[PDB]
Structure formats: C-alpha cells, structure tokens
Design a protein around this nucleic acid. Structure first.
Ligand SMILES: *OP(=O)(O)OC[C@H]1O[C@@H](n2cnc3c(N)ncnc32)[C@H](O)[C@@H]1O
Ligand SMILES: [Mg+2]
Length: 71
DNA sequence: AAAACTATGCATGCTCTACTGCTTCTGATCTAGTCGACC
C-alpha cells in the first residue's frame, strides 16, 4: 500500500522490498533520512495571467533560474 | 744401377659460419564512433 511513498524518500529498491515484505505490516512514519536520496521537488509551468490565483492571493517569492545540474 | 718406402703439394667433397633480400608480427599513432548522465 505504501511503497511509492517509501521509494520517493529512499530511491532504493532493496529497502522498499525488505522493509515492506509483509503487506499487513506497514511503516509508521516515512521521511527524508540522512544518506538516502530523495526525489527532488519539481516545478510546473505558469501562465502569467493567473499567477496570483496560483499563489492564493498572497505574497510570493521570485528568484532566478540557474542553468546547471541539480544536486 | 734398380726397386721400395715416405714427404709434400694439390684436387676433391662435405660441413659450418656471415650477409643480403622477402615475408610476417608487433607496436605506435590517428581517426571515427558509442555510451552515461545532465540539461
Ligand atoms: O525545466 P525544468 O523542469 O528542468 O526546471 C526545473 C529545474 O530548474 C532548476 N532550477 C534552477 N534554479 C532553481 C530554483 N531556484 N528552484 C528550483 N529549481 C531550480 C533545477 O535543476 C530544477 O530541477
Ligand atoms: Mg537546468
């Protein structure tokens, strides 16, 4: 039931298959752990007209986009 | 004076050791292409 969630945090099939061996027994809490790769949060295209509606009519942060690798 | 034994030179074959030329193997180099991973 909770395997995609664990893989989004560990990115290691071995841990997913070992920890989640019994379907009945789940994982109490799954979160980013040290020395375990986590799938980075990505960004979606924006239509400038509705930008405010996308920010729930509140303040937002503007930053520059950098041309390089993600680490 | 005549005959028998021996010495030395030379021809002859076979065997062994350098030098030139052809063929093949290795090393080194360059050029073209593939793959990982990102975006
Ligand atoms: O087009 P895309 O989906 O790759 O864009 C997202 C990527 O953009 C890079 N990036 C650069 N600067 C930022 C900031 N400030 N925040 C988030 N992402 C940023 C990342 O590499 C990202 O995956
Ligand atoms: Mg980028």
């Amino acid at each position: 039931n909770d395997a995609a969630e664990l893989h989004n945090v560990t990115t290691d099939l071995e841990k997913v298959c070992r920890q989640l061996h019994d379907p009945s027994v789940g994982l109490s809490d799954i979160s980013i752990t040290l020395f375990s790769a986590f799938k980075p949060m990505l960004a979606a295209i924006a239509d400038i007209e509705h930008i405010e509606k996308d920010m729930k009519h509140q303040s937002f942060y503007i930053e520059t986009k950098l041309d390089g690798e993600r680490m």
